[PDB]
């Protein structure tokens, strides 16, 4: 069906053919949003559909494309990755994603790691020519994001997929640009991937080894550490151990056998680890059912889990067919490299005697011989159970060997023990890191101690820590040895006194000299370790004195020197920012003392000084001031910025604007140029590109000498006429050009040009007085030729394709160079140079008619050149001194020609993204000159036919380029509105769509622009005074839907501001909305979209707004049929009815309107119970809180006065407000501090609650009844949630209600409410027949009111003997005979668990041997009395009124049945009071069961629960002892034995459990009935089980005890 509808809507005009484009882009984001780890489908299940719909239609076109679906899917998968922003954010780290596993958006990361695996499983096949034009853009995009975001696994995964497909098709026989960029990124990853871990590492490895390399066979030497890492990180995670070997097969045929043959002693000898219910159905024959269970698991095997045996077999096959000359390298390198480093005695002599005590002999065995197996088994297990055992064994071994040595030294053995404890304490595991971390704290503590100080194991521990800090690949270990070295440093100074500790070789300064010799050591890890130690110890030793000023900030210069010595190793590896942190933590401690203690004593001498005696700041400032000219790259900046920060710290408290001039006027410019030049003040071989190692050193010399001038001149610190060169002319002869090393010359050669560009930029922009002092040879034909070579074809001046940093660096610098020449005397120099190269006739002739088609580079060079030229010319800050090109006022012709060129360019007589972006760049070129919006908007309204073998000629032109057009439209104001509204009635659909194209881009740029929304609104509204006339006869359906939608958008773009004081078009916009929703013009199911837009206007006064309410309720009463729903589901009446009703409800839920509540309540209080009545409850919870409580009391006032009015309504409608609309708003949380609706409410209806009952006519009677009953319910809800420290105390309720302030304490008016509600529910009605059908509700609500007010009594004593109980029945004030109904009947059906019954039988054996309103629980006195009885339980024989009054009234067999059911239903819910009183409460519960006045055919549910509740409290008054209960219990047993059959399955088991639990409880009032069981199993007629009940009952009555004796009572 899916392929049929897709193939149906694709054989027609191309407007509906883009529905198929947006539906797959919707479906991808649909299925790719689940959480990915009944059931939730993850993403797996959809691959079958996405495999079917692509091209299987050629075998699915039986009764009833592929490239369209393919291109749509690839567009939808690389369009999501455009807009995701996967930037990840956030004890010193060294590994790069160590603690930075904090993504910003987890619901896009989990929308991405799903996306990549879905793309992998859909696209490794069926690509036979389809994936070919989709490779460069995909790879360039992914290199761009992965360079912008390095360590995100998955970009490598999609890159591997596309390079697999680019291997499978040919594509690589060397279109040149992708081949040029892959090599650069290959070396980039192959140096970068060192400091990573598991999954990212596997990602980079399966990327690297999947490169084709039979045509990229150059430079194999930087892939071999990435091929021998797969086989060694293999063996546990299998598929990359597979892909390395598939690559090793891939190389060894096509690669020549002469670049390869030395590279076998490193590939092959690491390949040396790889040589080491069906029968349940079938037991009962095989007849079609084993066939069923066989075919239902015949399928479901699709996994290619490469198990290790196929690995070993392909290893041996490849090793055999590899060669004979070459195999035998496989093991000569080992057996002496790494084998005998394990094959040696650990200590030559053997230690560790151990006596294991047997019963009587005690031999001695030596714990050495297994230690090189316990140790290896602890570090790795490839096992789960042996791991924890070996770790525990090694921990106990370590404790033993520690305890032995203080009674036989062991220091030949600690050196190979102690490097295992760290690697175990910080590896990966949970439980062995719960261990071994306190072990390595304990051992560090005991060894950093004077009991074993200056000892030969302490140096083993320290050297093992330092070798732990400095190594290759172990990035999760150095940051643990940091905490070891901090504990080392703390304990070594906590206890040791300075009377000793003047000699020791484990001491503090020995560690410091260790650190400095590590620092100047040229191994990069060897000084990375020292900066890591400093990261971990600068939080110490500044928190103590007397060690600071001596040598560590002398060695601040050696940390600077370590930075300098880290000059040009590798920028990605992470040393430079490490040491920059190490000195960032040093400036903030030199600056917090040496502002104050600028002293002069002998401090320890740093490296690179003459041996002085005072070491204040001034010598270091002179160090930096004669050593600013250090020509290395990334230490110069730290030296300069430390100079600038250190000059406002001298005792003179100086500044660089004066101090540099002060030292320059005395020392000569030679002193401030020999520092700037150094020892390096001062060949036609540069014509060939080469990297002579001297010339790079002079290039570095040139860069340092030019950037030293930059700060002192371009910042106002010196005077440039004091200082103010031939080396730049020495270099500027052959600037425009060792196979790979030439590019290393290219980088440093392209370094100098951008620096001198910005240098001449600042030296113009700060020097008007020294303007002329520039020598004019810079205005020659070289700078203004490399300008055009920069903007055009820059791969022949140095700027490659393959470094995306400098190509985005260039518009910052070239465009600012051209902006720093507009205000110069040598401006016309640049003009008259450039006008022959940025000319307009080049633009005129290179936009030739041959543009579209199979031209792949020949058009592209010229078109990219001219678009780059013109766009950077526009950015250049100076254009109308280059190309005026017209003189009327201002115009240009070829831009409009390009508009017509692009419009003609798609006329039939192709679509690909390269030429499409060409077309977009050209149509963007066509806008920068002048206005031109009028010609485009006039072109768009063309009724021409672009004849296709034809639709509309220009709407597709708008839908092609859809952002550039309206982002041009949004630039200019105050005339775009008029030029759009002039095209009004002839172009209705297009002027609507282009106002949409204005607005929904205006709303999007909001937090950045914040002008265009409100300005577009306040400008578009004043032209709405003219374009009103749309809706009339002849289709107000169309040409009004756009009007109302446009209204909604122009009102949502701003606040509701054009509806007050008639400021905007409020008369106009008001009469538009009134003329819209005043007429019932459309059908039923279409005015919902119009009526959703209510809450904007609803803040005016009365008159017009109540006219809107009047026409709303007018169309409402026009709509609904008579009185209620009448709409069953399945129809477009019920569902759309409740949809527009739900729209009303959510508008009410988002509006704080004191009117629309009064609208919706009457339609609510017209049906008996609404369908979305619960949606009323949740929406009233929502509207119950709004803030600024003057509006809540307004809502309550509105409904209070809509109820208190005197219009003749029904009793039900007068009741239903005060039932379920205002009670609900009083219910959830109105406000706890809201007391206004109790203070200002009482005095007008409490008097009608103290009124007369004028029994004259029922029409004025029943409405008065409903009013009084509602006043009762209001008092109930206002005494329910109201505390008692203001209404039964001295506050503003009695102060409000009595008359002002009086002497009344508070407990007088609660009493006159109590006496009136107790005058209620005491009214007998013995002689009447009038309307008591509501008076029962009256009495019961008054009973609840009495409960509510005794709850606000604080319950210090028992007044319940007068209130709610104990009437005077001699005067017939009978409580129960009216408020209990006694006139309706009670159904109680038969039944229609087992765990409850087995639990109750278990507890009965061990003893002897929320609610649910069903039928009686809605007696509407139930739940408050349950709460009250529970309060009388947990507040403080028999108890008089709440226990003994019922004891008197329930043990009397004359009382009605329904009071007995009420009190029994009470006591089963409230048995907890009658748990310590049940020895009296034992008879009547069973009397109701045994007496035959029960109901139906017995109260069978009351029967089962009353027996369940009387034998729940077994162990306390079993039925024995009472004589009447004896015969009544035997009556119970005989009765239940009579009625026991009930043909349903489990309920018979239920019945038997009742009987057996009952007799098992009893067993003492023996009295078991006979002759009935005889009547059961005396059944003849052998065809049905009439005695099955008899025999199973006989098994019950025998299986306990007490045999079936017949001839005593039977026969």
- The pair of three-digit structure tokens given for residue 1435, joined into one six-digit string: 């507040």
Report DSSP letters for 1448-1507, one per residue: HHHS-TTS-HHHHHHHHHHHHHTTTTTSSSTTTTTSHHHHHHHSS--SSSS-HHHHHHHH
- Go through 562-595 and write b for each residue having 16 or more CB atoms within 10 A of its CB, e for each that does not: bbbbbeeeeeebbbbebbbbbbeebeebbeeebe
Whether 150 contacts 191, CB under 8 Å: no
Pairing relation of β-strands 88-89 and 364-366? unpaired
| Contacts for 519 with CB less than 8 Å, ≥ 6 apart | 527, 530, 531, 558, 559, 561, 562
Q: Which two tokens stand for residue 408?
A: 């036989």
Neighbours of 1192 (CB within 10 A): 24
Q: What are phi and psi of 945, to 5 degrees?
A: -120, 115
**256 to 168, 215, 687, 1267: CA distances (angstroms):** 21, 11, 34, 104
Reduce the DSSP state of residue 103 to 3 states and report it: strand
Q: Tokens 């947006």 appear where?
A: 22
Q: Contact 103/134 with Cβ under 8 angstroms? A: no
Residues 362 and 364: their CA atoms lie apart, in Å, by 7
Cα of first residue to Cα of last residue in the chain, in angstroms, is 79
Structure tokens at 130: 């389809």
Distance, CA of 464 to CA of 470 (rounded, Å) = 10
Residue 365 host element (H or E): strand 364-366
**Residue 552: enclosing H or E segment and its boundaries?**
none
Contact 786, 833 (CB under 8 A): no
Cα three-residue angle 997-1000-1001, rounded to 5 degrees: 80
What single DSSP character describes residue 1444? I
Q: Say how many C-beta atoms besides its own lie within 10 A of residue 545's C-beta.
A: 9
Task: Report how far residue 1096's alpha carbon sits from residue 1020's, in angstroms, rounded to the nearest whole number.
Answer: 18
Residues 6 or more apart in contact with residue 1148 via CB below 8 angstroms: 1156, 1157, 1160, 1179, 1183
d(CA 993, CA 997): 6
What distance in Å separates the CA atoms of residue 745 and residue 735, rounded to the nearest whole number? 11
- Count the alpha carbons within 13 Å of 160 in the hemisphere toward its beta carbon: 20
Q: Give the C-alpha separation, 191 to 185, whole Å.
A: 10
Cα angle value 1064/1068/1074 (rounded, 5°):
125
Rounded Cα–Cα distance for residues 874 and 880 (Å) = 10
Nearest of 1170, 1186, 1177, 1164 to residue 1223 by alpha carbon: 1177
CA dihedral 1192, 1198, 1200, 1203 (to 10 degrees): -150
Which helix (H) or strand (E) segment holds residue 1271: the answer is helix 1258-1280
C-alpha span between 1414 and 1308 (Å, rounded): 41
CB atoms within 10 A of CB 1411: 9
Q: Is 1130 helix (H, G, I), strand (E, B) or coil?
A: coil
User: What are the structure tokens assigned to 1252, written together?
Assistant: 């007369």
From residue 631, how far is each of 213, 565, 712 by CA, in Å? 40, 12, 17
Q: How far apart are CA 1185 and CA 1191, in angstroms?
A: 10
> Which of these, 1448, 1308, 1427, lies nearest to 1376 by C-alpha position?
1448
Picking from 458, 481, 403, 462, the residue whose alpha carbon sits closest to that of residue 91 is 481
Helix axes 806-819, 741-765, angle to 10 degrees: 30
Q: Are 522 and 566 in contact (CB under 8 A)?
A: no
The structure tokens 């484990």 sit at: 506
Q: On the CB side of 347, how many CA atoms lie within 13 Å of its CA?
A: 19
Read off φ and ψ for residue 842, nearest 5 degrees. -60, -40
How far, in Å, CA of 1280 to CA of 1341, rounded? 13
CA distance linking residue 1410 with residue 1393, whole number of Å: 17
DSSP string, 1028-1049: -TT-SSS-SSTTTHHHHHHHHH
Of 174, 213, 162, 165, nearest to 190 (Cα)? 213
- The DSSP secondary-structure symbol of 46 reads G
Please give the DSSP secondary-structure letter assigned to residue 729. H
Looking at 574-617, list the stretches that DSSP marks H as alpha helix, in order from N- to C-terminal side: 576-590
Q: How many CA atoms lie within 13 A of 1292 on its CB side?
A: 8
Report the SS3 class of residue 1297.
helix
CB 1549 within 8 A of CB 1512: no
- Categorise residue 1465: left if φ over 0, alpha if ψ from -120 to 50, beta otherwise: alpha
3-class DSSP assignment, residue 353: strand
Measure the CA–CA gap between 853 and 956, rounded to whole angstroms: 20
Spatial CB neighbours of 770, under 8 Å, sequence gap ≥ 6: 720, 721, 724
Q: From 1185, 1180, 1222, 1191, select the one nearest 1204 (Cα to Cα).
A: 1222
| Eight-state DSSP code of residue 539 | T
Read off the tokens for 170. Answer: 């040919």
User: Cα angle vertex 524, ends 573, 144, to 5°?
Assistant: 10
Q: How far is it, in rounded angstroms, from Cα 203 to Cα 942?
A: 55
For the record, the structure tokens of 344 come out as 């040696």
- Rounded to whole angstroms, the Cα distance separating 957 from 968 reads 16
Please return the burial class of 1217, using the count of CB atoms within 10 Å of its CB with bins 0-12, 13-18 and 19+: buried
Q: CB–CB of 1365/1346 below 8 Å? A: no
Instruction: Classify 1051 in phi/psi space as left (phi over 0), alpha (psi -120 to 50) or beta.
Output: alpha
Among 487, 563, 560, 555, smallest CA distance to 528 is for 563
Task: Answer yes or no: are the C-beta atoms of 1249 and 1317 closer than 8 Å.
Answer: no
CA distance 1611 to 1602: 18
Strands 88-89 and 353-355: unpaired
Ordered DSSP codes for 472-503 = SS-TTTHHHHHHHHHHHHHHHHHS--TTS-SS
User: Rounded distance, CA 224 to CA 262, Å?
Assistant: 12
**Contact call for residues 897 and 851 (beta carbons, < 8 A):** no
Which residues face 103 on adjacent strands? 88
- Report the candidate in 1094, 1106, 1016, 1087 with the shortest Cα–Cα distance to residue 1054: 1016
Q: At what angle do helices 1012-1020 and 988-1002 cross, to 10 degrees?
A: 150
Question: Which pair of structure tokens corresponds to residue 12?
Answer: 């027609």
Asked if 1472 and 1509 touch (Cβ cutoff 8 Å), the reply is no
Residue with tokens 């950015």: 875
364-366 and 353-355 strand pairing: antiparallel
Are 603 and 537 within 8 A, CB to CB? no
The one-character DSSP state at 1359 is: -
What tokens appear for 1283 in the block?
Answer: 């505390």
Beta bridge partners of 353: 366
520 forms beta bridges with none
Give the dihedral of Cα atoms 78, 79, 83, 88; nearest 10 deg.
-20
According to DSSP, the β-strands at 102-103 and 88-89 are: antiparallel
φ/ψ of residue 992, rounded to 5? -70, -45
- Note whether 1141 and 1172 are within 8 A (CB): yes
In sequence order, the 6+-apart residues with CB closer than 8 A to the CB of 423 are 379, 477
Closest CA to 1409 of 1593, 1559, 1513: 1559
Question: How far apart (Å, rounded) are the C-alpha atoms in residues 812 and 267?
Answer: 47
Q: How many CB atoms lie within 10 A of CB 1311?
A: 10
User: Three-class SS string for 1140-1206?
Assistant: HHHHHHHHHHHCCCCCHHHHHHHHHCCCCCCCCHHHHHHHHHHHHCCCCCHHHHHHHHHHHHHHHCC
Name which of 458, 466, 506 is nearest 485 in CA terms.
466
CA angle, residues 1303, 1308, 1309, in degrees to nearest 5: 110
What is the rounded distance in angstroms from the CA atom of residue 197 to the CA atom of residue 322?
A: 33
Contact 146, 152 (CB under 8 A): yes
The two three-digit tokens of residue 429, written as one number: 């595991």
Query: Which H helix or E strand runs over 1433?
Result: helix 1422-1433
Does residue 8 come out as left (phi exceeding 0), alpha (psi in the -120 to 50 range) or beta? alpha
Query: Helix, strand or coil for residue 56?
Result: helix
Give strand pairing partners of 88: 103
Question: DSSP states of 923-951 as a string?
Answer: HHHTTSSS--HHHHHHHHT----------
Nearest to 460 by CA among 504, 416, 494, 428: 416
Query: How far from 1522 is each of 691, 1529, 1566, CA to CA, in Å?
Result: 118, 10, 14
The continuous run of DSSP H or E covering 1014 comes out as helix 1012-1020
């990602």: which residue's tokens?
Answer: 203
Collect all residues with Cβ–Cβ distance below 8 Å to 213 and sequence separation of at least 6: 220, 223, 247, 250, 251, 255
Pairs from 1100-1103 (Cβ < 8 Å, separation ≥ 24): 1100/1059, 1100/1060
Residues 988 and 942: beta-carbon distance below 8 Å: no
Please state, in angstroms and rounded to a whole number, the distance separating the CA atoms of residues 828 and 821: 9
Residues with Cβ within 8 Å of residue 1113, at least 6 apart in sequence:
1159
Q: What share of the chain is helix, strand, coil (3-state, %, to 5)?
A: 55, 0, 45
Counting Cβ atoms within 10 Å, is residue 907 exposed (0-12), middle (13-18) or buried (19+)?
exposed
Residues 690 and 1280: their CA atoms lie apart, in Å, by: 94
DSSP alpha helices (H): ranges in 774-882? 783-791, 806-819, 827-834, 840-845, 858-875
Element (DSSP H or E) covering residue 364: strand 364-366
d(C-alpha 1152, C-alpha 1184), whole Å: 10
CA angle 385–386–389, rounded 5-degree value: 100
**Widest Cα–Cα separation across the chain:** 143
Residue 887: burial class (beta carbons within 10 Å; 0-12, 13-18, 19+)? exposed
What experiment produced this structure? Answer: cryo-EM
């Amino acid at each position: 069906a899916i392929v049929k509808v897709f193939l149906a809507l694709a054989a027609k005009g191309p407007v509906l053919r883009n529905c198929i484009s947006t539906v797959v882009h919707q479906g991808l984001i649909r299925i790719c949003s689940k959480p990915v780890v009944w059931k939730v489908p993850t993403y797996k299940d959809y691959v079958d559909l996405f495999r079917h719909l692509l091209s299987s239609d050629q075998m699915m076109d039986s009764i009833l494309l592929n490239h369209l679906l393919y291109d749509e899917f690839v567009k939808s998968v690389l369009k999501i990755v455009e807009k995701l922003d996967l930037t990840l954010e956030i004890m010193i780290p060294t590994s790069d994603p160590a603690a930075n596993l904090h993504p910003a958006k987890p619901k896009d990361f989990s929308a991405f790691i799903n996306l990549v695996e879905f793309c992998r499983e859909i696209l490794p096949e069926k690509q036979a020519e389809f994936f070919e034009p989709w490779v460069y853009s995909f790879s360039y995009e992914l290199i761009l994001q992965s360079t912008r975001l390095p360590l995100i696994s998955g970009f490598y995964k999609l890159l591997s997929i596309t390079v697999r497909n680019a291997k499978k098709i040919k594509y690589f026989e060397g279109k040149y640009s992708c081949f040029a960029l892959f090599v650069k990124f290959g070396k980039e990853v192959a140096v970068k991937m060192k400091q990573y871990k598991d999954e990212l590492l596997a990602s980079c490895l399966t990327f690297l080894l999947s490169l084709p390399h039979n045509i990229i066979e150059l430079d194999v030497r930087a892939y071999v550490p990435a091929l021998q890492m797969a086989f060694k990180l293999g063996l546990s995670y299998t598929p990359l151990a597979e892909v390395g070997l598939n690559a090793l097969e891939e190389w060894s045929i096509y690669i020549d056998r002469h670049v390869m043959q030395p590279y076998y002693k490193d590939i092959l000898p690491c390949l040396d680890g790889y040589l080491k219910a069906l029968s349940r159905a079938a037991q009962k024959g095989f007849n079609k059912v084993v066939l069923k269970h066989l075919k239902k698991t015949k399928n479901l095997s699709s996994n290619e889990a490469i198990s290790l045996e196929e690995i070993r077999i392909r290893v041996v096959q490849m090793l055999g067919s590899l060669g004979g000359q070459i195999n035998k390298n496989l093991l000569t390198v080992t057996s002496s490299d790494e084998m005998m480093k394990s094959y040696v005695a650990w200590d030559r002599e053997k230690r560790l005697s151990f006596a294991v005590p047997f019963r009587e002999m005690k031999p001695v065995i030596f714990l050495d011989v297994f230690l090189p197996r316990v140790t290896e088994l602890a570090l790795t297990a490839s096992d789960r159970q042996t791991k924890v055992a070996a770790c525990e064994l090694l921990h106990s071994m370590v404790m033993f060997m520690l305890g032995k040595a203080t009674q036989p030294p062991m220091y030949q053995l600690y050196k190979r023990t102690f490097p295992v404890l760290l690697r175990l304490a910080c590896d990966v595991d949970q439980v062995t890191r719960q261990l071994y971390e306190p072990l390595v704290m304990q051992l560090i503590h005991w060894f950093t101690n004077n009991k074993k100080f200056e000892s030969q194991d302490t140096v083993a521990l320290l050297e093992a820590i330092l070798d732990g800090i400095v190594d290759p690949v172990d990035s999760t270990l150095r940051d643990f040895c940091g905490r070891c070295i901090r504990e080392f440093l703390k304990w070594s100074i906590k206890q040791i006194t300075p009377q000793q500790q003047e000699k020791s070789p484990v001491n503090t300064k020995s560690l410091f000299k260790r650190l400095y010799s590590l620092a100047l050591h040229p191994n990069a890890f060897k000084r990375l370790g020292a900066s890591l130690a400093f990261n971990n110890i600068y939080r110490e030793f500044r928190e103590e004195e007397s060690l600071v000023e001596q040598f560590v900030f002398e060695a601040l210069v050696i940390y600077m020197e370590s930075l300098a010595l880290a000059h040009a190793d590798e920028k990605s590896l992470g040393t430079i920012q490490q040491c920059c942190d190490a000195i960032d933590h040093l400036c903030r401690i030199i600056e917090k003392k040496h502002v104050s203690l600028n002293k002069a004593k002998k401090r320890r001498l740093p490296r690179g000084f003459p041996p002085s005696a005072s070491l204040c700041l001034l010598d270091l400032v002179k160090w930096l001031l004669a050593h600013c000219g250090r020509p290395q790259t990334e230490c110069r900046h730290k030296s300069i910025e430390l100079f600038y920060k250190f000059v406002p710290l001298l005792p003179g408290n100086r500044s660089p604007n004066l101090w540099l001039k002060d030292v320059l006027k005395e020392e000569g410019v030679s002193f401030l140029i020999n520092t700037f030049e150094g020892g390096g003040c001062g060949l036609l071989y540069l014509r060939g590109p080469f990297s002579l190692q001297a010339t790079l050193c002079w290039l570095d010399l040139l860069l340092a000498a030019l950037e030293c001038y930059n700060t002192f001149i371009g910042e106002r610190t010196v005077g440039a006429l004091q200082v103010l060169l031939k080396a730049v002319a020495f270099f500027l002869e052959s600037i425009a050009m060792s196979p790979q090393e030439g590019e290393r010359y290219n980088y440093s050669k392209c370094t100098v040009v951008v620096r001198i560009m910005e240098f001449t930029t600042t030296l113009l922009n700060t020097s008007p007085e020294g303007w002329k002092l520039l020598k004019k040879d810079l205005c020659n034909t070289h700078l203004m030729r490399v300008l055009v070579q920069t903007l055009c074809e820059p791969a022949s001046i140095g700027f490659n394709i393959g470094d995306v940093q400098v190509m985005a660096h260039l518009p910052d610098v070239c465009v600012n160079l051209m902006k720093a020449l507009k205000m110069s005397p040598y401006k016309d120099i640049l003009e008259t140079h450039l006008r022959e190269k940025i000319t307009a006739q080049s633009i005129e002739e290179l936009c030739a008619v041959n543009l579209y088609g199979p031209d792949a580079q020949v058009d592209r060079s010229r078109l990219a050149a001219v678009v780059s030229a013109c766009k950077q010319l526009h950015r250049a800050g100076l254009l109308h001194n280059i190309l005026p090109s017209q003189s009327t006022d201002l115009h240009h012709s070829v831009g409009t020609e390009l508009l017509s060129l692009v419009y003609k360019g798609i006329a039939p007589g192709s679509l690909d993204l390269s030429c499409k972006q060409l077309a977009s760049g050209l149509l963007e070129l066509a806008f920068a000159f002048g206005g031109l919006c009028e010609r485009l908007v006039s072109l768009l309204l063309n009724p021409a036919v672009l004849s296709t073998a034809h639709f509309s000629h220009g709407e597709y032109f708008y839908s092609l380029f859809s952002e550039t057009i309206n982002t041009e439209l949004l630039k200019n104001l105050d005339l775009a509105v008029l030029e759009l509204m002039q095209s009004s009635v002839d172009n209705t659909k297009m002027v609507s769509a282009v106002l949409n194209g204005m607005l929904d881009q205006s709303f999007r740029e909001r937090a950045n622009q914040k002008h265009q929304g409100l300005k577009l609104a306040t400008t578009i509204l004043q032209h709405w005074k003219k374009c009103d006339s749309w809706w009339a006869k002849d289709s107000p359906l169309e040409t009004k839907m756009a009007v109302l939608a446009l209204l909604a958008k122009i009102l949502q773009i701003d606040s509701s501001v054009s509806f007050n004081t008639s400021h905007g078009s409020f008369p106009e916009v008001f009469t538009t909305y009134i003329s819209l929703l005043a007429d019932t013009k459309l059908d039923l199911h279409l005015k919902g979209q119009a009526v959703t837009l209510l809450p904007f206007f609803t803040s005016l006064t009365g008159g017009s707004l109540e006219e809107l309410r009047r026409v709303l309720e007018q169309l409402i009463v026009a709509h609904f049929p008579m009185q209620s729903r009448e709409f069953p589901p399945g129809t477009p009446r019920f569902n759309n009815y409740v949809d527009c009703m739900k729209k009303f409800l959510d508008a009410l839920e988002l509006s704080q309107s004191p009117m629309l509540l009064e609208l919706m309540t009457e339609v609510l209080c017209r049906e008996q119970q609404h369908v979305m009545e619960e949606l009323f409850q949740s929406s009233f919870r929502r509207i119950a809180r709004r803030g600024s409580c003057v509006t809540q009391v307004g809502l309550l006032e509105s409904v209070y006065e809509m109820f208190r009015k005197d219009d003749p309504r029904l009793s039900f409608t007068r009741q239903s407000f005060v039932d379920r609309s205002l009670l609900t708003l009083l219910w959830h949380c109105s406000l706890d501090a809201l007391r206004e609706f109790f203070s200002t409410i009482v005095v007008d209806a409490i008097d009608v609650l103290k009124s007369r009952f004028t029994k004259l006519n029922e029409s004025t009677f029943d409405t008065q009844i409903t009013k009084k009953m509602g006043y009762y319910k209001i008092l109930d809800v206002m005494y329910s949630r109201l505390p008692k420290d203001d209404v039964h105390a001295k506050e503003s309720k009695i102060n409000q209600v009595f008359h002002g302030s009086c002497i009344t304490e508070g407990n007088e008016l609660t009493k006159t409410l109590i006496k009136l509600c107790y005058d209620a529910f005491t009214e007998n009605m013995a002689g009447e027949n009038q309307l008591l059908e509501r008076r029962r509700l009256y009495h019961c609500a008054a009973y609840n009111c009495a409960i509510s007010v005794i709850c606000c009594v604080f319950n210090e004593l028992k007044f319940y003997q007068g209130f709610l109980f104990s009437e005077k029945p001699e005067k017939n004030l009978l409580i129960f005979e009216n408020l209990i109904d006694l006139k309706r009947r009670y159904n109680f059906p038969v039944e229609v668990r087992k765990k409850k019954y087995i639990e109750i039988r278990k507890e009965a054996r061990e003893a002897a041997n929320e609610l649910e309103m069903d039928e009686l629980n809605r007696h509407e006195c139930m739940a408050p009395l349950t709460a009250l009885v529970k309060h009388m339980h947990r507040s403080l024989r028999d108890l008089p009124s709440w226990m003994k009054f019922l004891h008197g009234k329930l043990g009397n067999p004359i009382v009605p049945l329904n009071i007995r059911l009420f009190l029994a239903k009470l006591v089963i819910n409230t048995e907890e009071v009658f748990r310590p009183y049940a020895k009296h409460w034992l008879s009547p519960l069973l009397q109701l069961a045994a007496s035959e006045n029960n109901g139906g055919e017995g109260i069978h549910y009351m029967v089962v629960e009353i027996v369940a509740t009387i034998l729940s409290w077994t162990g306390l008054a079993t039925p024995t002892g009472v004589p009447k209960d004896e015969v009544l219990a035997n009556r119970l047993l005989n009765f239940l034995m009579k009625h026991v059959f009930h043909p349903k399955r489990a309920v018979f088991r239920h019945n038997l459990e009742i009987i057996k639990t009952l007799v098992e409880c009893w067993k003492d009032c023996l009295s078991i009935p006979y002759r009935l069981i005889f009547e059961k199993f005396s059944g003849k007629d052998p065809n049905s089980k009439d005695n099955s009940v008899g025999i199973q009952l006989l098994g019950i009555v025998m299986a306990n005890d007490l045999p079936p004796y017949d001839p005593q009572c039977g026969i």
